[PDB]
Design a protein around this ligand. Structure first.
Ligand SMILES: CCCCCCCCCCCCCCCCCC(=O)OCC(COC(=O)CCCCCCCCCCCCCCCCC)OC(=O)CCCCCCCCCCCCCCCCC
Ligand SMILES: CCCCCCCCCCCCCCCCCC(=O)OCC(COC(=O)CCCCCCCCCCCCCCCCC)OC(=O)CCCCCCCCCCCCCCCCC
Ligand SMILES: CCCCCCCCCCCCCCCCCC(=O)OCC(COC(=O)CCCCCCCCCCCCCCCCC)OC(=O)CCCCCCCCCCCCCCCCC
Ligand code: HEA
Ligand code: HEA
Ligand SMILES: CCCCC/C=C/C/C=C/CCCCCCCC(=O)O[C@H](COC(=O)CCCCCCCCCCCCCCC)COP(=O)(O)OCC[N+](C)(C)C
Ligand SMILES: CCCCCC/C=C\CCCCCCCCCC(=O)O[C@H](COC(=O)CCCCCCCCCCCCCCC)COP(=O)(O)OC[C@@H](O)CO
Ligand SMILES: CCCCCC/C=C\CCCCCCCCCC(=O)O[C@H](COC(=O)CCCCCCCCCCCCCCC)COP(=O)(O)OC[C@@H](O)CO
Ligand SMILES: CCCCCC/C=C\CCCCCCCCCC(=O)O[C@H](COC(=O)CCCCCCCCCCCCCCC)COP(=O)(O)OC[C@@H](O)CO
Ligand SMILES: CCCCCCCCCCO[C@H]1O[C@H](CO)[C@@H](O[C@H]2O[C@H](CO)[C@@H](O)[C@H](O)[C@@H]2O)[C@H](O)[C@H]1O
Ligand SMILES: C[C@H](CCC(=O)O)[C@H]1CC[C@H]2[C@@H]3[C@H](O)C[C@@H]4C[C@H](O)CC[C@]4(C)[C@H]3C[C@H](O)[C@]12C
Ligand SMILES: C[C@H](CCC(=O)O)[C@H]1CC[C@H]2[C@@H]3[C@H](O)C[C@@H]4C[C@H](O)CC[C@]4(C)[C@H]3C[C@H](O)[C@]12C
Ligand SMILES: CC(=O)N[C@@H](CO)C(=O)O
Ligand code: CUA
Ligand SMILES: [Cu+2]
Ligand SMILES: [Mg+2]
Ligand code: NA
Ligand SMILES: [O-]
Ligand SMILES: [Zn+2]
Lengths: 514, 144, 49, 84, 227, 43, 105, 46, 72, 49
């Protein structure tokens, strides 16, 4: 049975669980790689050795947190758990295909871990730019194994997107229009269209790099007429869309949590939040050259990308100001998960502006390849995308398990993590102003104090990560069974009991046409 | 009182200021005596004791509004335990310095900083605001 | 009864904040971590020739 | 430059209105603003009596017969130079 | 160069970089605002017992929520685009130095008049002369004449580098087979430091830049003394 | 969220263990790689 | 979409329904605490009297608890409401939270 | 049909909390141990 | 003695309409503070520095100090 | 119509409304939506032969 239940599954819930587990393990590896980074920078001089071994660690840290932690939990975990229960569907359009999207991910990881143990590992950065990533500087299997990680990891994603979109479009109650599906449901649909359209061009680019290293093409080799910059475009054509992928479902959860814990029966401005993400999606595709402002491109182009990158702030504003209105005259219940959402709203808005800075080709001249950039995207990812994750996880843990966590403990967790990521990253704003470059094992004497402090923060964030492993145990150890849940009348997921049965909606919901 | 898992599908009771009259009573099942108070509730309400009034209130509802809305000392435990775990976190840092982290470079010894500092004022590092501008060149000392 | 936060709230709050202040001061001031503070009005410039 | 919204699987009249107000007119206003920021009397070209321009093989059937229909004396020469 | 505990930008040695500081000063005025209005309004909503859980109407407030930020954004762009076109501009340069990036040093070519070329490595910590700035000092400096318009062409003979001098407001990528043009104007003389701003392999950290600006007449001799 | 009582209550003492074991499972091996660092380089 | 006099009227009418049932009694109280307003005493009257029809003393207290709550920090509202209601209160022997001791922690 | 209800819908067992601590110890700990033993092996070659 | 009828409607409306001004004020007065305290200083400090600047007297003291390779 | 003693009903209380009201429906008296008070009644049957 066990082999039939977990290896062979066609259960949208049992598959969600597999992802929550995979993405939890990934996080452990992601954390270690991030601690190592700040071990090396926490005092002047050299700890591991040269920039090489350092950048294999930096690079790996990026792929694991992005591709094996944030997308696997957020899309595959919470997707596969919540989506079908929010639209009263019994499972996913393509449940067999759903499971291959899972089992393609261990492999994908193992090729990544292989890469770091073959030759001197692939310290190329997560951008994998030729000619460093090419067969003369990075001769060996490392960079090939990394390209193969991404191929499998992009097949998982694209197959999983086909599944969600076909599920959310096709398998609602007949009476239900798209305009009466929850915000999460919307977030995931949009996030699957971004995946569907961007990952193919990512794959195409890393395919030309394989055939430059192995089959004697010259796509990115000036010797044969090629252009290294061509690669930057195809990758960033994917790579902006990749980040609105990583936040959109966070929008989703955050719209949910702030609504449920303000005691409101729907979030403020439903259709506003629909227009917002369909915009953020759309404009997220027409901005990719803001990652390439020091490559030497025509001034008329650079000013378009500046201006286009900044339009995104209006629809993102609408969402910030909505959540805040969803709190207005709420009956605020001060749970851990409300704390996670509240933090999101302010540290996302910090990071969000620090990137409107970056929108200006002018400044990015000086801010490009400094920590200022690292600071921007650790506020939106570490202090947004992970806050959504811990928020959601905290709010929905009893639905998956049937047990409660200890809320005191779980605020003690929020408390320490808050102090850790802010002390980690608030000083990185100062470093990049003072012009500390990225991707350096060692720094000029000047930059020491902030680098000491930044790394102290990364040791507080570790206490957090260890506490959360002991808080998951306690709850299972203790086995306090959920009895009753509020606000069920507007939150269909909670209607089938914690945890809900293997087969849900075996008999579909009644919804009539008025 | 006692609630079962199995009846997630049935209207449940809850204390909530935005839902002050919930879907069911707190006490479903009445003793002999409780039945005869419910009987007294069909007559004039002036013919009830205070004792007899409190009891009727506690059958239909679990916690009072003032009870459901009372503040705690969670924060004491939440702030002080955080400050213990942030404390712990230094023991790792002290361990790291003592056993892991080698000796730092010689360009950090008192001597070098002093020579390197003047060398920097000698090339007028940041002379409009940041460094050399915080130095008096006539009196030959940091500005007051 | 009174709850965990009544019985122990102050103990936890008092003894955390204290153990926190002690080890951090100590770790900042007593093990020879090099902070490299601004030399301004501190270091006395010396000739380097 | 792509598109990414994801089927608005409800009712037509409503979705085309969403699109009218959320996309169509927003972009007509962004575009108007981008000309209300580029518009102006940009400075008029030096005159050269290039023979492959200001062609008169036959008078026009109006004015003195030497002036185009949407003529603009500020920017549009005759064969023999600007007016004024 | 950057000094201990530094909060903000290096001091503007070139006017363009000055222009950035004041522009940067503008953008942070608004950042400091939106961050405070959001932190304030958050606390406002959370610090009342009075309630309103019944359905609420958007249209009229969602108008303020768009038309204000669209103005706030022209306000930022209007100068951002001025300063960007100002970086192009029909300038008249008197000197053309080409720099090449290598794994892991920088070579220089002054080839207007003569065939003057040389490499530029980092002083290993062990060999710094007391006073010398760890990870920043180079054996052979880029001597440039101060107070004149200079044309720098950047390329690399191997991986990607980035040619980067914060204090002057310069950073241009070295792309093999590609000659990228920037322009260099020091308002002052002195020593002006920078580092590789693209990951190029084992010693990316350790391949810095140092400009030496000096008069024209102390330059022409330095040129002739290097051939 | 209303819950039952715990079926297998985890006393303080039991909590103190789980905390002790969990902190060590991360801390101990990391320590043994980071402590023997010097040794790895002389090769 | 209506004046305040219509609102106050519309709700009093709801609560002076004589074959009002307890599903309708709970509905209207749980609908009404939703709005940015403490109800007029003439509604608290109408409701307190729909309880009497329904032989539910309990809910008639809870209603008075909810008045004091919808007010929040405006301390002077509840005392004025409890003046305007004093008649209906001693008519029906409805005792207030404060009297039954259910304002004690 | 597979087991329904709390502690039944996972691929591990929560039937005894001290085997469970051993299980979470390995699972999470192995994953955090991994980068370190990988950095070791890269220094231990050349 | 009877209590007089207080304001009973749109209590939360009133609270917001009052404080929305208070947040405009805080922010917009943090606006002024930054102009005075920082921006208008930068412009005053660059203008004051460059006004009576002889780049040859800079070069000269730098040359005597032994910093340059091109200028002994 | 249901094959069991309960089935989940969703109530779109007014056209175009963004929020469906959900609740369990039981064999018995009719049940009213807790939003608009619309009435619903369970009608057991089967699908054997
Ligand atoms: C407050 C705004 C926060 C803004 C921050 C935003 C950005 C950062 C995110 C930061 C967001 C976190 C904000 C925490 C404030 C919560 C306090 C509270 O209202 O307590 C909650 C209450 C709930 O009360 C009830 O059981 C029901 C009553 C109804 C709700 C009560 C409050 C409603 C408002 C009424 C106030 C009274 C009128 C005052 C009138 C107005 C006064 C002027 O429980 C209690 O009695 C006490 C239990 C609290 C336990 C959690 C402590 C939080 C620790 C977090 C530390 C992080 C930083 C590191 C620190 C430790 C390391 C050193
Ligand atoms: C624990 C973490 C570490 C924190 C770091 C504290 C630093 C302590 C050290 C000594 C500290 C002395 C000065 C205190 C101000 C520190 C930061 C600042 O404002 O510095 C200004 C600028 C740099 O500007 C400069 O050019 C500095 C000029 C300073 C002149 C003032 C007069 C002289 C005193 C200052 C000395 C330097 C003067 C010489 C220099 C002259 C010119 C460079 O920094 C930046 O651009 C930073 C970019 C971050 C933007 C994030 C948005 C805000 C998030 C939160 C908002 C709500 C609050 C809730 C907040 C809650 C969330 C956080
Ligand atoms: C009869 C023989 C059958 C033969 C078949 C095989 C043997 C079966 C046993 C015999 C059959 C009898 C039935 C077993 C009863 C349970 C006993 C048990 O505890 O047995 C233990 C079993 C099963 O172990 C697991 O399931 C793995 C989890 C380990 C426990 C940690 C708990 C996690 C806590 C955190 C959760 C919070 C988040 C989620 C919270 C949400 C809650 C829903 O051990 C194994 O034999 C491993 C088998 C693999 C199963 C799938 C695991 C999913 C892999 C995830 C990716 C890993 C990352 C690496 C990636 C790759 C990189 C290299
Ligand atoms: C979840 C991840 C995430 C998110 C959400 C964002 C959000 C944004 N990012 Fe960022 N970004 C990254 C992840 C993210 N980014 C990563 C990983 C990189 C680096 C890749 C690498 O180089 O390694 C990067 C790099 C990056 C660069 C390149 C910098 C450089 O390489 O030098 C730029 C330039 O424009 C940029 C811009 C933006 C903008 C405009 C937003 C906007 O979406 C933010 C908009 C939101 C707000 C502004 C706040 C809410 C709005 C309001 C409250 C309205 C009022 C506002 C105004 C009036 C202005 N990002
Ligand atoms: C999701 C992406 C993500 C996340 C979360 C992080 C988290 C962190 N990062 Fe990373 N980082 C990047 C993506 C990310 N980073 C990228 C893309 C780069 C650029 C890479 C390049 O240059 O090529 C980068 C670069 C980078 C640098 C610069 C490298 C250099 O230039 O030298 C540094 C330096 O300190 C750093 C530190 C940290 C720290 C301390 C954390 C900490 O904040 C993390 C603390 C730990 C956690 C947040 C754990 C969370 C775990 C879970 C939530 C799992 C549990 C869930 C369940 C059980 C369901 N990061
Ligand atoms: C960038 C920052 C800018 C900030 C934007 C600021 C906005 C300014 C608005 C100020 C007004 C405050 C309104 C909110 C409080 C609730 C109002 C309310 O409760 O109003 C009810 C709303 O319900 C109905 O109709 C249904 C329709 C609802 C209409 C009321 C809600 C609109 C406002 C909500 C948005 C909150 C956002 C704040 C945080 C961002 C209507 O009831 P009545 O007609 O009987 O009232 C009559 C009262 N008289 C006689 C005194 C006028
Ligand atoms: C160099 C090596 C790199 C690695 C590449 C190899 C990776 C994977 C190879 C394995 C793929 C072959 C196995 C067969 C998969 C068929 C899936 C399928 O065809 O799935 C169908 C739905 O997909 C549909 O139509 C729509 C989707 C059809 C897609 C078909 C499978 C795609 C596999 C290749 C993906 C490449 C990505 C292209 C874009 C870059 C059916 O859905 P099921 O849930 O199955 O059943 C549901 C039942 O109701 C059916 O009766
Ligand atoms: C915003 C979207 C608009 C796209 C349409 C525009 C297409 C072509 C316009 C070009 C016409 C001019 C032709 C002669 C000039 C050469 C082309 C050119 O201008 O572009 C060159 C090649 O890029 C290229 O077309 C790149 C190749 C085209 C890629 C287009 C990008 C979008 C692709 C995704 C679309 C997917 C949709 C599905 C397909 C139907 C690159 O720039 P250079 O010119 O080398 O600059 C040299 C410098 O010295 C500048 O001074
Ligand atoms: C400074 C470092 C030291 C650590 C600081 C302390 C950390 C956290 C401990 C938090 C203590 C509990 C918090 C109070 C309330 C929530 C949890 C709780 O105490 O557990 C209650 C057990 O009850 C009961 O006393 C029944 C009996 C069981 C009591 C459970 C708690 C006892 C042990 C707590 C102390 C742990 C010591 C840890 C030392 C490492 C159950 O929860 P309720 O209160 O019924 O409500 C929660 C709702 O979801 C259910 O409807
Ligand atoms: C960044 C992630 C982790 C940061 C915080 C880590 C703190 C480390 C916890 C302790 O771990 C270490 O403890 C000892 C050192 O104090 C090591 O003993 C070493 O040293 C002893 C004496 O010095 C020997 O006797 C032992 O066998 C051994 O070699 C031990 O092996 C190692 O696990
Ligand atoms: C960057 C890319 C070329 C990719 C490549 O060289 O491989 C080109 C293709 C089409 C270009 C765009 C289109 O030509 C239309 C616009 C023309 C304007 O002069 C600049 C912005 C403008 C929006 C262009 C920006 C940029 O140069 C684009 C996006
Ligand atoms: C028509 C459409 C959908 C509403 C509905 O059909 O239910 C609504 C919802 C979101 C609205 C937009 C957003 O609310 C944001 C903008 C708000 C401004 O006041 C008008 C333009 C603005 C761009 C709106 C246009 C239109 O009113 C939209 C697009
Ligand atoms: C003035 C006075 O006597 N007031 C009364 C209020 O009714 C008291 O009691
Ligand atoms: Cu050369 Cu980095
Ligand atoms: Cu981007
Ligand atoms: Mg770059
Ligand atoms: Na280092
Ligand atoms: O971004
Ligand atoms: Zn209804």
């Amino acid at each position: 049975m066990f082999i039939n239940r977990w290896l062979f599954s066609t259960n949208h819930k049992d598959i969600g669980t597999l992802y929550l587990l995979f993405g939890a393990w990934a996080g452990m590896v992601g954390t270690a790689l991030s601690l190592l980074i700040r071990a090396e920078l926490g005092q002047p001089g050299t700890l591991l050795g040269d920039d090489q071994i350092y950048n294999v660690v930096v690079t790996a840290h990026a792929f694991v947190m992005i591709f094996f932690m944030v997308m696997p939990i957020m899309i595959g975990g919470f997707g596969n758990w919540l989506v079908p229960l929010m639209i009263g569907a019994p499972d996913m359009a393509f449940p067999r295909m759903n499971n291959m999207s899972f089992w393609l991910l261990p492999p994908s990881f193992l090729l990544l871990l292989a890469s770091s143990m073959v030759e001197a590992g692939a310290g190329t950065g997560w951008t994998v730019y030729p000619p460093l990533a090419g067969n003369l500087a990075h001769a060996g299997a490392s960079v090939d194994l990394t390209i193969f990680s991404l191929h499998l990891a992009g097949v998982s994603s694209i197959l999983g997107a086909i599944n969600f979109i076909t599920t959310i479009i096709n398998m609602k109650p007949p009476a239900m229009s798209q305009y009466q599906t929850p915000l999460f449901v919307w977030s995931v649909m949009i996030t699957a269209v971004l995946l569907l359209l961007s990952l193919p061009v990512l794959a195409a680019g890393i395919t030309m790099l394989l055939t430059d290293r192995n089959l004697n093409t010259t796509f990115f080799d000036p010797a044969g007429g090629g252009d290294p910059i061509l690669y930057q475009h195809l990758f960033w054509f994917f790579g902006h869309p990749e980040v609105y992928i990583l936040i959109l479902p966070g929008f989703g959860m955050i719209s949910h949590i702030v609504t449920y814990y303000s005691g409101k029966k729907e979030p403020f401005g439903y259709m506003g939040m629909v227009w917002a993400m369909m915009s953020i999606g759309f404009l997220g595709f027409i901005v990719w050259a803001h990652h390439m402002f020091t490559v030497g491109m025509d001034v008329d182009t650079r000013a378009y990308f500046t201006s286009a990158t900044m339009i995104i702030a209006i629809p993102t504003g609408v969402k910030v100001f909505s959540w805040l209105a969803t709190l207005h005259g709420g009956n605020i219940k001060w749970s851990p998960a409300m704390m996670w959402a509240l933090g999101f709203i302010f540290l996302f808005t910090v990071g969000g502006l620090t990137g409107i800075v970056l929108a200006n080709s002018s400044l990015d001249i000086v801010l490009h390849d400094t920590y200022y950039v690292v600071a921007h995207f650790h506020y939106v990812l570490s202090m947004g995308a992970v806050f959504a994750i811990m928020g959601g996880f905290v709010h929905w843990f009893p639905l998956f398990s049937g047990y409660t966590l200890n809320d005191t403990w779980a605020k003690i967790h929020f408390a320490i993590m808050f102090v850790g990521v802010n002390m980690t990253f608030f000083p990185q704003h100062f470093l990049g102003l003072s012009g500390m470059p990225r991707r350096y094992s060692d720094y000029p004497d000047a930059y020491t104090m902030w680098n000491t402090i930044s790394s102290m923060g990364s040791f507080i964030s570790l206490t957090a990560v260890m506490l959360m492993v002991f808080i998951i145990w306690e709850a299972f150890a203790s086995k306090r069974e959920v009895l009753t849940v509020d606000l069920t009348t507007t939150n269909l997921e909670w209607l089938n009991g914690c945890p809900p049965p293997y087969h849900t909606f075996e008999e579909p919901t009644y919804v009539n046409l008025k | 009182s006692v609630v079962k898992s199995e009846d997630y599908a049935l209207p449940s009771y809850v204390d909530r200021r935005d839902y002050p009259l919930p879907d069911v009573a707190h006490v479903k099942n009445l003793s002999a005596s409780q039945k005869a108070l419910k009987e007294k509730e069909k007559a004039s309400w002036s013919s009830l004791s205070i004792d007899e009034k409190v009891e009727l209130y506690r059958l239909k509802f679990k916690e009072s509004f003032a009870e459901m809305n009372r503040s705690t000392n969670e924060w004491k435990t939440v702030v002080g335990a955080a400050m213990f775990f942030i404390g712990f976190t230094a023991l790792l840092l002290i361990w790291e310095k003592h056993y892991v982290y080698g000796p730092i470079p010689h360009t950090f010894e008192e001597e070098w900083v002093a020579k390197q500092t003047k060398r920097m004022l000698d090339m007028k590092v940041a002379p409009i605001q940041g460094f050399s501008a915080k130095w008096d060149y006539d009196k030959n000392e940091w500005k007051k | 009864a009174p709850d965990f936060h009544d019985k122990y709230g102050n103990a936890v709050l008092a003894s955390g904040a204290t153990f926190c202040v002690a080890v951090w001061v100590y770790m900042a001031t007593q093990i020879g971590i090099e902070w490299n503070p601004s030399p301004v009005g501190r270091v006395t410039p010396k000739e380097w020739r | 430059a792509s598109a990414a919204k994801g089927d608005h699987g409800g009712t037509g009249a409503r979705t085309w209105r969403f699109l009218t107000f959320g996309l169509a007119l927003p972009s007509v206003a962004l575009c108007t603003l981008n000309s209300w920021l580029h518009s102006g009397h940009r400075e008029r070209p030096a005159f050269i009596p290039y023979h492959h321009l200001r062609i008169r093989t036959k008078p026009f059937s109006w004015g003195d017969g030497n002036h185009t229909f949407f003529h603009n004396p500020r920017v549009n020469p005759l064969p023999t130079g600007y007016e004024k | 160069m950057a000094y201990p505990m530094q909060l903000g930008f290096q001091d503007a040695t070139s006017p363009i970089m000055e222009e950035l500081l004041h522009f940067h000063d503008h953008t942070l005025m608004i950042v400091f605002l939106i961050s405070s209005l959001v932190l304030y309004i958050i606390s406002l909503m959370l610090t009342t017992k009075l309630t309103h859980t019944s359905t609420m109407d958007a249209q009229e407030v969602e108008t303020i929520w768009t038309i204000l930020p669209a103005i706030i954004l022209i306000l930022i762009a209007l100068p951002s685009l001025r300063i960007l076109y100002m970086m192009d501009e029909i300038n008249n340069p008197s000197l053309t130095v080409k720099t090449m990036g290598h794994q892991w040093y920088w070579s220089y070519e002054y080839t207007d008049y003569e065939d003057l070329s040389f490499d530029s490595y980092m002083i290993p910590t062990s060999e710094l002369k007391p006073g010398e700035l760890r990870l920043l000092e180079v054996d052979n400096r880029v001597v440039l004449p101060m107070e004149m318009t200079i044309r720098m062409l950047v390329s690399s003979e191997d991986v990607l580098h980035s040619w980067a001098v914060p204090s002057l407001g310069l950073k241009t990528d070295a792309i093999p087979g590609r000659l990228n043009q920037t322009t260099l104007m020091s308002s002052r003389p002195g020593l002006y430091y920078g580092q590789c701003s693209e990951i190029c392999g084992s010693n990316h950290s350790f391949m810095p830049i140092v400009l030496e600006l000096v008069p024209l007449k102390y330059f022409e001799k330095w040129s002739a003394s290097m051939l | 969220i209303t819950a039952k009582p715990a079926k297998t209550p985890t006393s303080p003492k039991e909590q103190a263990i789980g905390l002790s074991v969990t902190f060590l499972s991360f801390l101990l091996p990391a320590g043994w790689v980071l402590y023997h660092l010097d040794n790895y380089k002389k090769s | 979409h209506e004046t305040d006099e219509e609102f106050d009227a519309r709700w009093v009418t709801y609560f002076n329904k004589p074959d009002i049932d307890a599903w309708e009694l709970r509905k209207g109280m749980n609908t009404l605490v939703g709005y940015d307003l403490v109800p007029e005493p003439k509604i608290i009257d109408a409701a307190l009297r729909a309880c009497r029809r329904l032989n539910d003393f309990a809910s008639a207290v809870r209603i008075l608890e909810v008045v004091k709550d919808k007010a929040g920090p405006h301390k002077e509202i509840y005392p004025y409401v409890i003046q305007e209601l004093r008649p209906t209160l001693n008519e029906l022997g409805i005792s207030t939270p404060e009297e039954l001791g259910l304002d004690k922690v | 049909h597979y087991e329904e209800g709390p502690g039944k819908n996972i691929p591990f067992s929560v039937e005894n909390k001290w085997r469970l601590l051993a299980m979470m110890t390995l699972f999470f700990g192995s994953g955090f141990a991994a980068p370190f033993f990988i950095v070791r092996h890269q220094l231990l070659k050349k | 003695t009877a209590l007089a009828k207080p304001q009973m409607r749109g209590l939360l409306a009133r609270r917001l309409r009052f404080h929305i001004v208070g947040a405009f004020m805080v922010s917009l007065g943090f606006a002024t503070f930054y102009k005075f305290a920082v921006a208008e200083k930068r412009k005053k400090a660059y203008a004051d520095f460059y006004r009576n600047y002889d780049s040859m007297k800079d070069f000269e003291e730098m040359r005597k100090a032994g910093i340059f390779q091109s200028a002994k | 119509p249901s094959i069991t003693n309960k089935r989940i009903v969703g109530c779109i209380c007014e056209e175009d409304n963004s929020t469906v009201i959900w609740f369990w429906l039981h064999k018995g008296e009719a049940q009213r939506c807790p939003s608009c008070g619309t009435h619903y009644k369970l009608v057991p049957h089967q699908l054997a032969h």
